[PDB]
Amino acid sequence: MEVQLVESGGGLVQPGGSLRLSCAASGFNIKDTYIHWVRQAPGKGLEWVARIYPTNGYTRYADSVKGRFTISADTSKNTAYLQMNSLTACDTAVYYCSRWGGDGFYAMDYWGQGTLVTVSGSDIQMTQSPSSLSASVGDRVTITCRASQDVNTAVAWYQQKPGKAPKLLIYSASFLYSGVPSRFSGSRSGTDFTLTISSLQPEDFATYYCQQHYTTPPTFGQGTKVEIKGSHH
Amino acid sequence: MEVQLVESGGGLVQPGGSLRLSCAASGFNIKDTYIHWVRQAPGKGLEWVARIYPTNGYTRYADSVKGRFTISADTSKNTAYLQMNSLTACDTAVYYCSRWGGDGFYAMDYWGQGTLVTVSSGGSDIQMTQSPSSLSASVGDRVTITCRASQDVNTAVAWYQQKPGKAPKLLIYSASFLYSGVPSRFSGSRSGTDFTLTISSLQPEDFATYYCQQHYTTPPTFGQGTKVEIKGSHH
Numbered sequence: 272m273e274v275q276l277v278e279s280g281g282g283l284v285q286p287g288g289s290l291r292l293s294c295a296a297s298g299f300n301i302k303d304t305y306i307h308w309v310r311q312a313p314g315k316g317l318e319w320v321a322r323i324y325p326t327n328g329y330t331r332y333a334d335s336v337k338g339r340f341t342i343s344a345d346t347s348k349n350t351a352y353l354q355m356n357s358l359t360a361c362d363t364a365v366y367y368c369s370r371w372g373g374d375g376f377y378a379m380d381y382w383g384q385g386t387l388v389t390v391s392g393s394d395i396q397m398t399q400s401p402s403s404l405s406a407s408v409g410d411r412v413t414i415t416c417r418a419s420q421d422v423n424t425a426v427a428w429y430q431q432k433p434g435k436a437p438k439l440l441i442y443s444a445s446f447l448y449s450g451v452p453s454r455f456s457g458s459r460s461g462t463d464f465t466l467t468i469s470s471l472q473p474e475d476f477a478t479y480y481c482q483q484h485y486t487t488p489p490t491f492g493q494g495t496k497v498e499i500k501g502s503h504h
Numbered sequence: 505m506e507v508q509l510v511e512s513g514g515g516l517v518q519p520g521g522s523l524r525l526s527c528a529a530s531g532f533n534i535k536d537t538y539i540h541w542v543r544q545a546p547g548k549g550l551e552w553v554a555r556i557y558p559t560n561g562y563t564r565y566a567d568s569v570k571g572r573f574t575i576s577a578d579t580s581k582n583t584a585y586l587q588m589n590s591l592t593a594c595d596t597a598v599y600y601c602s603r604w605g606g607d608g609f610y611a612m613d614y615w616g617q618g619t620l621v622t623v624s625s626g627g628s629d630i631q632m633t634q635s636p637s638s639l640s641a642s643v644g645d646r647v648t649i650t651c652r653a654s655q656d657v658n659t660a661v662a663w664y665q666q667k668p669g670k671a672p673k674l675l676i677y678s679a680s681f682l683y684s685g686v687p688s689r690f691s692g693s694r695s696g697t698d699f700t701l702t703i704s705s706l707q708p709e710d711f712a713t714y715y716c717q718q719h720y721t722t723p724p725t726f727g728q729g730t731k732v733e734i735k736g737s738h739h
Contacts, residue, residue, distance in 0.1 A: 319726075335520040436616065484611065
């Protein structure tokens with residue numbers, strides 16, 4: 272019989288979710304060798320994550336998955352397993368199952384075809400437009416955000432200067448936060464929200480974020496960079 | 505006192521490591537509102553991470569950190585905490601402490617200065633430095649791919665070949681032994697910690713990505729890979 276490793280169980284998983292992969296072997300007994308799991312992020316290299324020697328119950332894990340991943344085996348079914356908990360986007364990869372040659376052979380002579388795990392939507396998504404805009408000092412700037420669902424008027428606007436923390440400008444769609452200059456203003460038109468700077472001042476060149484607090488969790492727009500007309504800046 | 509939030513605890517961490525961030529609050533009582541954690545990856549936007557209501561310990565998280573991050577509070581010290589386990593390259597970001605303004609005011613009116621958390625990739629594992637990263641070659645060319653181990657790995661080195669959409673295939677084992685069935689145009693060699701894969705005459709079926717791997721210690725480590733692409737045409 273031909274030596275063969277067949278992985279299964281991959282698919283799309285929500286972040287923080289969990290998944291169990293299996294690797295069915297034929298042509299040999301997994302009891303007599305180490306079974307490894309090696310993964311490959313899309314377009315990246317190879318990373319060993321775990322191995323098991325079912326005869327002795329030996330298991331080893333890479334530091335990047337220790338405490339999160341569990342390797343096991345069922346020799347009666349000649350199948351190894353990889354249990355993956357609290358998955359993140361950095362776990363998206365093709366998960367290969369492989370084996371050592373046995374005896375004093377420590378290269379991986381046989382690999383499975385691989386199974387793809389993709390770690391991924393009820394959150395309210397906010398879409399700001401444009402992504403960036405150039406303006407001259409004193410111009411009238413208007414930035415728009417669109418909520419994927421109705422958020423009443425529970426929308427806030429924040430300004431962030433490079434290297435600094437965000438600072439609140441507008442709350443409840445149209446109320447000016449105390450201390451924020453008069454040239455800033457907000458408005459709503461259904462699911463469309465607008466931030467308006469009447470006459471641009473040099474200290475207003477920054478990135479602006481919309482945010483909804485109608486429901487949990489709070490979600491931000493991707494941001495709008497407002498820079499001076501010209502190149503490099 | 506003016507309202508203030510001070511973060512601390514960030515730093516450099518290897519993948520899978522742990523880190524504990526602190527947010528020391530002053531000018532207000534954290535029992536009166538929510539304390540949030542918001543992070544920002546370099547050059548990217550703002551992502552809400554977690555929140556806690558220190559009055560009754562209610563906590564919620566973003567899905568991207570569930571099961572790995574734990575937010576907590578010590579009302580006696582007016583301080584919130586973010587324990588980060590199983591750290592990960594996607595967690596590299598500046599982490600901001602923030603609060604909701606209070607009852608009937610759900611904006612984040614006060615933010616901390618932020619603390620930087622960097623998840624590395626310089627580690628105790630043996631590094632395998634492969635070169636080149638890509639090579640354009642014609643059929644019949646002689647090709648050499650070399651890899652340097654960061655320390656002695658004896659001859660416990662293997663060379664693998666991976667075609668697009670396929671699994672890696674073993675070519676050379678123990679540094680210079682040809683795997684059964686692999687053509688004789690493939691050969692390996694060791695010079696100290698330098699390991700070289702040689703294809704005497706490149707064939708049309710040889711265009712793939714090639715990986716060096718050491719198995720002298722655990723974990724086994726792979727080189728970054730060398731993509732050999734075709735130069736010319738046969739159509």
